[PDB]
Coordinates of C-alpha atoms and ligand atoms in Angstrom, one line a residue:
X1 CA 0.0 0.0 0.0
X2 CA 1.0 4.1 0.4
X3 CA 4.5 4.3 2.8
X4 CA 5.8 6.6 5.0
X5 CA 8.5 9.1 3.2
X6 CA 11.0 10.7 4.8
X7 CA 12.8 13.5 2.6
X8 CA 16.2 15.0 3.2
X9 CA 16.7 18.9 2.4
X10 CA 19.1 21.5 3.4
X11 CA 17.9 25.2 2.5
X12 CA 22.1 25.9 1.7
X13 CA 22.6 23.1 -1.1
X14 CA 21.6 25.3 -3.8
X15 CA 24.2 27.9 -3.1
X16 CA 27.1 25.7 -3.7
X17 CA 28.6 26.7 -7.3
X18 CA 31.0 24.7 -8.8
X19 CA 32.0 27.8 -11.0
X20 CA 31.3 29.5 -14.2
X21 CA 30.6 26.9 -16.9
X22 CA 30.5 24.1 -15.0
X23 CA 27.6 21.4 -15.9
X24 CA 26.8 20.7 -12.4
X25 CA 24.5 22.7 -10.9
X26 CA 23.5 22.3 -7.2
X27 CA 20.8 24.9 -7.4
X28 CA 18.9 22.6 -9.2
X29 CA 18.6 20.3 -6.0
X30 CA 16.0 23.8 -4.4
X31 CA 14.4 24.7 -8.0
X32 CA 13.2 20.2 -6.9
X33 CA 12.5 21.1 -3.7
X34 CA 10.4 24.5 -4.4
X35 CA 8.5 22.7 -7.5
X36 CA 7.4 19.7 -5.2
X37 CA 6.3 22.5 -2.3
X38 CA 3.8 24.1 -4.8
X39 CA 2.4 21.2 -6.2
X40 CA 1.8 20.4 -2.1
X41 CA 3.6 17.0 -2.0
X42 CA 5.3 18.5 1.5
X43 CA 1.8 17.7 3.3
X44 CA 2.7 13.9 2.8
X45 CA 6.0 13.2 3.7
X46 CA 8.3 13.6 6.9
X47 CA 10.6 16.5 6.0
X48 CA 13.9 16.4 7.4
X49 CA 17.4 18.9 7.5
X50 CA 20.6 16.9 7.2
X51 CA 22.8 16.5 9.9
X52 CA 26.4 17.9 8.3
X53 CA 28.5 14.3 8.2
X54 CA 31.6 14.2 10.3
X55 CA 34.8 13.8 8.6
X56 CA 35.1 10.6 10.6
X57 CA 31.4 9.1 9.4
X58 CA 32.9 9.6 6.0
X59 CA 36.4 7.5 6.9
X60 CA 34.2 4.6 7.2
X61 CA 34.8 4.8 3.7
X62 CA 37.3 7.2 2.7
X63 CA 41.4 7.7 3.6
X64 CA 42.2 10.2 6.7
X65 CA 44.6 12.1 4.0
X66 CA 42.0 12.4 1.4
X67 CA 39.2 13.7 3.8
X68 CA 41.7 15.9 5.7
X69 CA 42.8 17.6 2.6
X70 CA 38.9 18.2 1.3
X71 CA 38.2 19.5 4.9
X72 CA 41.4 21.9 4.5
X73 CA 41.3 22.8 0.4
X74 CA 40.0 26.7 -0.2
X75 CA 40.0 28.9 -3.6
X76 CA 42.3 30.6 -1.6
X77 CA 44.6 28.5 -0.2
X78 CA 44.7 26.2 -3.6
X79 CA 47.9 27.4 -4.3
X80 CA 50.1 25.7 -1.8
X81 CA 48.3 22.5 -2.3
X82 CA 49.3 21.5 -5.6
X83 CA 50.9 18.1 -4.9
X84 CA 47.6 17.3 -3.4
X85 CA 45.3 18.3 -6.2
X86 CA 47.3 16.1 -8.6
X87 CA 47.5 13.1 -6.4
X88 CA 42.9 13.4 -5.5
X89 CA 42.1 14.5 -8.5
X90 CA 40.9 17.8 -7.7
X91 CA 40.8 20.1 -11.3
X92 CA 38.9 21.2 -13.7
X93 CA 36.1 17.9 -13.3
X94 CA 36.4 18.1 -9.3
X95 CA 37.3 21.4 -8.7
X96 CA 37.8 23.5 -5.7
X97 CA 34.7 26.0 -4.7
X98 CA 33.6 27.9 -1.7
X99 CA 32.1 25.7 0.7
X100 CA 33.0 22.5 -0.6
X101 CA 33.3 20.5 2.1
X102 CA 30.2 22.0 3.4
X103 CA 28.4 20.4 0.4
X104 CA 30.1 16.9 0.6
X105 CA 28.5 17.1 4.4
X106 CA 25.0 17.8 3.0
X107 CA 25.2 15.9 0.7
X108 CA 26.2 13.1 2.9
X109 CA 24.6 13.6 5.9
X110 CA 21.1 12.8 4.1
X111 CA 21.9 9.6 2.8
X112 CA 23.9 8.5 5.9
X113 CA 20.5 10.2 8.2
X114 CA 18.3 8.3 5.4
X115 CA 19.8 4.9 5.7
X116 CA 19.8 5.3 9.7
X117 CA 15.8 5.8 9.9
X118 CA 15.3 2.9 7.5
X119 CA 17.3 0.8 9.2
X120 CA 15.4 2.0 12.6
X121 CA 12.3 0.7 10.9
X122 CA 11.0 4.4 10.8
X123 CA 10.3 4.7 7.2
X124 CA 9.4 2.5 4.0
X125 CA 11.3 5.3 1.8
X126 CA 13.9 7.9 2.7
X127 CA 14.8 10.5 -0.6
X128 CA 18.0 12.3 -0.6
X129 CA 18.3 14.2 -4.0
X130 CA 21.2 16.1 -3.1
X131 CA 23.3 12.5 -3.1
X132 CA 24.1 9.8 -5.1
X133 CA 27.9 11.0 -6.2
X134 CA 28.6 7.3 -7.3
X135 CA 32.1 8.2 -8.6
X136 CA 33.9 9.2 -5.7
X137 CA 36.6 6.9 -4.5
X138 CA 38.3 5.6 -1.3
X139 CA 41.4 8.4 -2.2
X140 CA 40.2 10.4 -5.0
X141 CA 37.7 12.6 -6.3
X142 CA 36.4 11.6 -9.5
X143 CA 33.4 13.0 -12.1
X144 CA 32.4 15.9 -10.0
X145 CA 31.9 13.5 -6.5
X146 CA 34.2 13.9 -3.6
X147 CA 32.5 12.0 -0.8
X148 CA 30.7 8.4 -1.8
X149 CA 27.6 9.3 -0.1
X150 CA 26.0 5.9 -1.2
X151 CA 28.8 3.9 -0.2
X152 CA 28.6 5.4 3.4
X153 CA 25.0 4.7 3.2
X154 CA 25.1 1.0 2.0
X155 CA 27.6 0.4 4.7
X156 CA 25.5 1.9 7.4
X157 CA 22.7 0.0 5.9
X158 CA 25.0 -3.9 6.2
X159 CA 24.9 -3.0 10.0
X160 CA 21.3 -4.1 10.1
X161 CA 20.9 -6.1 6.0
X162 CA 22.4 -9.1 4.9
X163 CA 22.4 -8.1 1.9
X164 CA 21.7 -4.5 -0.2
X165 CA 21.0 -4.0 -3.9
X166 CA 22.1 -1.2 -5.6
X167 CA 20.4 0.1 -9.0
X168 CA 21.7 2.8 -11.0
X169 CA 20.2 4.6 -13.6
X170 CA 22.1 7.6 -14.3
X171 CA 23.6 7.7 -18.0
X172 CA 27.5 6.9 -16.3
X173 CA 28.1 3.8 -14.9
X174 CA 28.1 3.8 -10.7
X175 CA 31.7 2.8 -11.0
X176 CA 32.8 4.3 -7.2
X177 CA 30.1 2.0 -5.8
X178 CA 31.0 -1.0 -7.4
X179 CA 34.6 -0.9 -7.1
X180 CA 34.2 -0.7 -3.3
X181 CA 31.7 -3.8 -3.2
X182 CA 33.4 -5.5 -6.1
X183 CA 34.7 -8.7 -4.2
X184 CA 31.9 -8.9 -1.2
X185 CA 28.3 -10.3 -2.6
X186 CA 26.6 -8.7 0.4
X187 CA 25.7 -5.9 -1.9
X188 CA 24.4 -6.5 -5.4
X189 CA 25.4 -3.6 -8.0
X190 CA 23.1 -3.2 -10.8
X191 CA 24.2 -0.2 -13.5
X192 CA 22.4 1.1 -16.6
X193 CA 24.8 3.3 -18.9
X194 CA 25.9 4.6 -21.9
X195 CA 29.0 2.6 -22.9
X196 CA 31.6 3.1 -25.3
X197 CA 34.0 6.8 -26.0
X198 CA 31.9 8.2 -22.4
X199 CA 33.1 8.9 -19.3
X200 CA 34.3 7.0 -16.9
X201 CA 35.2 4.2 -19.4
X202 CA 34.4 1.1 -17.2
X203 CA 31.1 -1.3 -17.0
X204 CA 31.7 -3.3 -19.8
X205 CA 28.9 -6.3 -19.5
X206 CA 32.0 -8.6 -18.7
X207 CA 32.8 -6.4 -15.5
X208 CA 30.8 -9.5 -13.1
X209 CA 33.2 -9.1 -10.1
X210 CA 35.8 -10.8 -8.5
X211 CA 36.4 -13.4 -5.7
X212 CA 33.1 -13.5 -3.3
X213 CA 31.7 -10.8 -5.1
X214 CA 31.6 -13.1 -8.5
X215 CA 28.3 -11.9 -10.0
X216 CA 27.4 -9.6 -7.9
X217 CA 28.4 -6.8 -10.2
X218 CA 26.0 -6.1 -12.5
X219 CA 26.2 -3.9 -15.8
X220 CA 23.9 -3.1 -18.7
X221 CA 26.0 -1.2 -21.7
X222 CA 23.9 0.8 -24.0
X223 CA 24.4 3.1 -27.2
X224 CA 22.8 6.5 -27.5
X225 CA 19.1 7.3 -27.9
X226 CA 17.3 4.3 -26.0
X227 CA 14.1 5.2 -25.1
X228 CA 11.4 4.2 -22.8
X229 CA 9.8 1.7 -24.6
X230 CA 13.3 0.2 -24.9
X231 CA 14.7 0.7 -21.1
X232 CA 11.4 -0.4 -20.0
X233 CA 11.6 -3.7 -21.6
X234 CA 14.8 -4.6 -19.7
X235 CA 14.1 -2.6 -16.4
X236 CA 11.8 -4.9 -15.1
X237 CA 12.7 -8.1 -16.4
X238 CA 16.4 -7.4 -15.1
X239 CA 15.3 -6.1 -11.7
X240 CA 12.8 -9.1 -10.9
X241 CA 15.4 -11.5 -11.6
X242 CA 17.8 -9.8 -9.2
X243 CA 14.7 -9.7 -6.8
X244 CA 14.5 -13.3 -7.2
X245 CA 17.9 -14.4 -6.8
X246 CA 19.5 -12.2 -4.7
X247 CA 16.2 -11.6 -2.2
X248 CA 18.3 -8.3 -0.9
X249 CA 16.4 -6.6 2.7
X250 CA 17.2 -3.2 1.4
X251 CA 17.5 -1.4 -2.0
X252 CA 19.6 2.3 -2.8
X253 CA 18.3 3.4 -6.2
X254 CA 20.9 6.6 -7.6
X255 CA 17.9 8.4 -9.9
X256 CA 20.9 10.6 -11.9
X257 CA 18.4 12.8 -14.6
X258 CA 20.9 12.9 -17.0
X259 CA 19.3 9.7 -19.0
X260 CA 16.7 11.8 -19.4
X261 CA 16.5 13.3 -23.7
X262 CA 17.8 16.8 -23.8
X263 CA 20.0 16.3 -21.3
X264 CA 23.3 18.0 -21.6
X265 CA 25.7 15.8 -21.3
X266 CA 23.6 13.0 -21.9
X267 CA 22.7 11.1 -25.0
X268 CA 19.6 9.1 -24.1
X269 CA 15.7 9.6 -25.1
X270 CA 13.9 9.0 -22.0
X271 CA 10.8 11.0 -20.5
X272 CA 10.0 11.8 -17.4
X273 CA 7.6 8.6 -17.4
X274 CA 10.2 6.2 -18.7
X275 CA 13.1 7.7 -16.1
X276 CA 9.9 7.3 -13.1
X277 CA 9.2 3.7 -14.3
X278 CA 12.3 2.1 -12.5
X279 CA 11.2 4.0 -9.4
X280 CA 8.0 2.0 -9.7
X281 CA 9.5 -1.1 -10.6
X282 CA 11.4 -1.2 -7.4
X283 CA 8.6 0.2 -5.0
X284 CA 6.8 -2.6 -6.3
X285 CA 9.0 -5.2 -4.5
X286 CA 7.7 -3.7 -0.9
X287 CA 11.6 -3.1 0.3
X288 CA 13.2 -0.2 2.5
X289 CA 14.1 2.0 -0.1
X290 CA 17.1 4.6 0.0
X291 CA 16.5 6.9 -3.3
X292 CA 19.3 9.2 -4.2
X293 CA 19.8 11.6 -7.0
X294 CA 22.9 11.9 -8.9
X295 CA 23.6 13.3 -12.5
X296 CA 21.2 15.8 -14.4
X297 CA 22.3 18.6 -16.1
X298 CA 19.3 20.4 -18.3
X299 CA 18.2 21.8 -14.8
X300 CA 14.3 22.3 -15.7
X301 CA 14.0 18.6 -16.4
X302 CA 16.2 17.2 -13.4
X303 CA 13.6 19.4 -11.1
X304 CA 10.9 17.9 -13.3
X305 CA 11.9 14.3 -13.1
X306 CA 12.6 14.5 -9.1
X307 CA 9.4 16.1 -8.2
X308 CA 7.5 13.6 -10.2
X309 CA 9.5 10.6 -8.4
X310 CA 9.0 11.8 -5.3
X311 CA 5.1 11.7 -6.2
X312 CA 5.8 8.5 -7.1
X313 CA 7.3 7.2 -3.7
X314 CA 4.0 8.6 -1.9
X315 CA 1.6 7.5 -4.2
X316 CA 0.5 10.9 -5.1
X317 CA -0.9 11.7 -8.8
X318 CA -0.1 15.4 -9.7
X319 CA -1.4 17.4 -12.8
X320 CA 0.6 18.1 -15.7
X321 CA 0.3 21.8 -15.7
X322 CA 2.7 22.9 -13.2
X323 CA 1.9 25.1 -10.6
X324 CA 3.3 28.8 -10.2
X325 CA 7.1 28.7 -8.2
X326 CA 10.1 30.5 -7.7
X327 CA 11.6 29.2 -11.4
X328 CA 8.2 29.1 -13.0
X329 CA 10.2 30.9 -16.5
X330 CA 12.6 27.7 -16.3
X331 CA 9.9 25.8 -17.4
X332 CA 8.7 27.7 -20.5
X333 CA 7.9 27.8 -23.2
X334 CA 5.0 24.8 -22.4
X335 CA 5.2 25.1 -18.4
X336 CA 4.0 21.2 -18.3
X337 CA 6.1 18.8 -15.9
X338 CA 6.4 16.2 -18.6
X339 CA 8.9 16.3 -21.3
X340 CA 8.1 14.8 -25.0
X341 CA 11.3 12.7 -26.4
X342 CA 13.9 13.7 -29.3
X343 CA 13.4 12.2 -33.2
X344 CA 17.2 10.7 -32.1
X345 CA 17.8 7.5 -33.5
X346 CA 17.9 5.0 -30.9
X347 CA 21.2 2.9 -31.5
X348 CA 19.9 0.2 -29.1
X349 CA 18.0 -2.1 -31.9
X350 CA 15.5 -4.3 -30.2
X351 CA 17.8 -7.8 -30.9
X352 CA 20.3 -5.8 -29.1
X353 CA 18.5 -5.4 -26.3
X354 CA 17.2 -8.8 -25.8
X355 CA 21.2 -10.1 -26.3
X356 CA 22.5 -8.1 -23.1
X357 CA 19.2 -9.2 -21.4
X358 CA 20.0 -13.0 -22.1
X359 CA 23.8 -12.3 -21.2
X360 CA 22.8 -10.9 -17.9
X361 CA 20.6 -13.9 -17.2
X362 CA 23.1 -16.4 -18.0
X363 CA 25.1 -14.7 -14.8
X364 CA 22.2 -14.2 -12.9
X365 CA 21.9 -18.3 -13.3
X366 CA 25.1 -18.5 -11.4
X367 CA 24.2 -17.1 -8.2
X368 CA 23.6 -19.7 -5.1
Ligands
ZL4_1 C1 26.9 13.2 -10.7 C2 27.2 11.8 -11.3 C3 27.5 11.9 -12.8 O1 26.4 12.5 -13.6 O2 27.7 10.6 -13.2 C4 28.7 12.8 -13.1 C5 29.2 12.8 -14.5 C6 30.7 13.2 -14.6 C7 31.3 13.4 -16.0 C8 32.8 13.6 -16.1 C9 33.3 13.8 -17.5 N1 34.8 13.9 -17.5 C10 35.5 13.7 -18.6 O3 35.0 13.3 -19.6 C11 37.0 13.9 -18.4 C12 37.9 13.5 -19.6 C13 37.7 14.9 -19.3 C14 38.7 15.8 -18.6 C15 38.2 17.0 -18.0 N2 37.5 17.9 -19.0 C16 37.0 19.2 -18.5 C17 37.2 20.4 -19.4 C18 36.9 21.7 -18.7 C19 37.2 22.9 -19.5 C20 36.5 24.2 -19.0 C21 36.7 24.5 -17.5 C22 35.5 25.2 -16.8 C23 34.1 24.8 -17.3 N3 33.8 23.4 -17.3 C24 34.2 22.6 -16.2 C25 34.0 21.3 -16.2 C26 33.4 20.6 -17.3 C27 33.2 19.2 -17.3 C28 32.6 18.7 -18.4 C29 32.1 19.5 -19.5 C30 32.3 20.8 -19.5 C31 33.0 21.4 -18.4 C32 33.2 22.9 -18.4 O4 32.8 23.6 -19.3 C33 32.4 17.2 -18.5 C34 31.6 16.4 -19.3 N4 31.8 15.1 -19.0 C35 32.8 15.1 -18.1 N5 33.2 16.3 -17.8 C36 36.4 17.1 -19.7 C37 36.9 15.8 -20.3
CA2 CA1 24.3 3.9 -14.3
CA3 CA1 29.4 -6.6 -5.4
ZN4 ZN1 25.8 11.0 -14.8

């Protein structure tokens, strides 16, 4: 039936500014929040104001040099850290802004507070959209992440869950998270993405893990323009599978917006719909549910494609006319929350499709 959602929001996040011309844009985390206050979805969910992570929640994870050095890093002090930059990976991808250690606490804090009141039995959903920076790793920033908010939260999550599925559906793969699970198979990693000459290079279909974690790595490469009638035919075959054979107590979904068509970096021809589809898929299967955000870069339709998932998690049916907000002219010319696809072709043939699919099942077969 309807569940309890909890929602984590810090009135600062959209202040951070990773600097002139960079695509990510943490102001579109409050034009979300401001769209899904006028169409009155606060009045159903449990509204919550992250805690700001510790540097030592996020060594569970991460080295003591690399978070001492993001806790200590300033525009201003750049200068006599230049041995450090080279050797985390802080430049023109990860760069060094005002405040941002502030944002990997935010950022943090409400998937770390998230998992905690799920695993405290306290909610049946918890919705960070200000997380879900899979690329970060243990020593190094990487693809405009620092601090591997899901990874913190799937750990806090194995102190009360066997075993945790992760599903990703941003256009890159989730490579952070699935390095640092690669050789345990008490989390399950599950990534939909764009493959071949795109960033970060890795989540081949061969990529199945190593050691314990042999298949428990999961990855789906697609080609540009896949659509919804395409991604749904493989979203809900794959994830019932998984469901099946790797009966996980807990599920952390990353919702990155830049699948969606038009996106700026992107190069798929999703909706709205299709992108708010998984999110139904895996509510379905009646599991505590961590959902994150992540990439999403034509701002109008990340704000879009949140607000309509967190109606989604309660249950709620909202019109398509959108109601007046604080960024009503981001939404012009149509001011509608849904979003029509591209006339791109989509690369992914059907045959193609199907052969992944059966390729993933063969390794799904192999699980105990
Ligand atoms: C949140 C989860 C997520 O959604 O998965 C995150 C997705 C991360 C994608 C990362 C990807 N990096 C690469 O492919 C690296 C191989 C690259 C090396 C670095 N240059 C950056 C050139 C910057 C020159 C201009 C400097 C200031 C403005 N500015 C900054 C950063 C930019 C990044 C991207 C596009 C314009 C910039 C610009 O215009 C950019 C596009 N794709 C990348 N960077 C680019 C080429
Ligand atoms: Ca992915
Ligand atoms: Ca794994
Ligand atoms: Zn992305």
């Amino acid at each position: 039936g309807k569940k309890k959602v909890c929602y984590y929001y810090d009135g600062d996040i959209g202040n951070y500014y990773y600097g002139q011309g960079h695509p990510m844009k943490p102001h579109r985390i409050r034009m979300t929040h401001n769209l899904l206050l006028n169409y009155g979805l606060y009045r159903k969910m449990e509204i919550y104001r992250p805690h700001k992570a510790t540097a030592e929640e996020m060594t569970k994870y991460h080295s003591d040099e690399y978070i001492k050095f993001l806790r200590s890093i300033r525009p201003d002090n750049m200068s006599e850290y230049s041995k450090q930059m080279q050797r985390f990976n802080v430049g023109e991808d990860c760069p060094v802004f005002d405040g941002l250690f502030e944002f990997c606490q935010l950022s943090t804090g409400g998937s770390v507070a998230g998992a905690v009141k799920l695993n405290r039995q306290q909610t049946d959903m918890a919705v960070n959209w200000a997380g879900g920076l899979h690329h970060a790793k243990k020593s190094e920033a990487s693809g405009f992440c620092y601090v591997n908010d899901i990874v913190l939260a799937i750990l806090e999550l194995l102190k009360y869950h066997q075993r945790v599925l992760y599903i990703d559906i941003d256009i890159h793969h989730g490579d952070g998270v699935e390095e640092a699970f690669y050789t345990t198979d008490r989390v399950m990693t599950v990534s939909f993405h764009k493959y071949g000459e795109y960033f970060p290079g890795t989540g081949d279909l061969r990529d199945i893990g190593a050691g314990k974690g042999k298949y428990y790595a999961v990855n789906f490469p697609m080609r540009d323009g896949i659509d919804d009638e395409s991604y749904g035919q493989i979203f809900k075959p794959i994830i019932s599978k998984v469901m099946e054979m790797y009966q996980p107590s807990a599920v952390v979904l990353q919702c990155g917006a830049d699948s969606l068509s038009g996106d700026r970096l992107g190069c798929f021809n999703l909706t709205v719909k299709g992108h708010a589809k998984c999110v139904e898929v895996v509510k379905t299967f009646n599991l505590p549910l961590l959902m994150l955000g992540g990439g999403g870069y034509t701002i109008r339709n990340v704000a879009r494609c949140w607000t309509y998932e967190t109606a989604v998690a309660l249950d709620c049916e909202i019109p398509n006319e959108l109601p007046y907000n604080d960024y009503f002219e981001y939404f012009g010319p149509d001011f509608k929350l849904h979003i029509s696809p591209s006339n791109m072709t989509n690369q992914n043939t059907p045959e193609y499709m199907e052969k992944i699919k059966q390729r993933l099942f063969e390794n799904l077969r192999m699980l105990p």
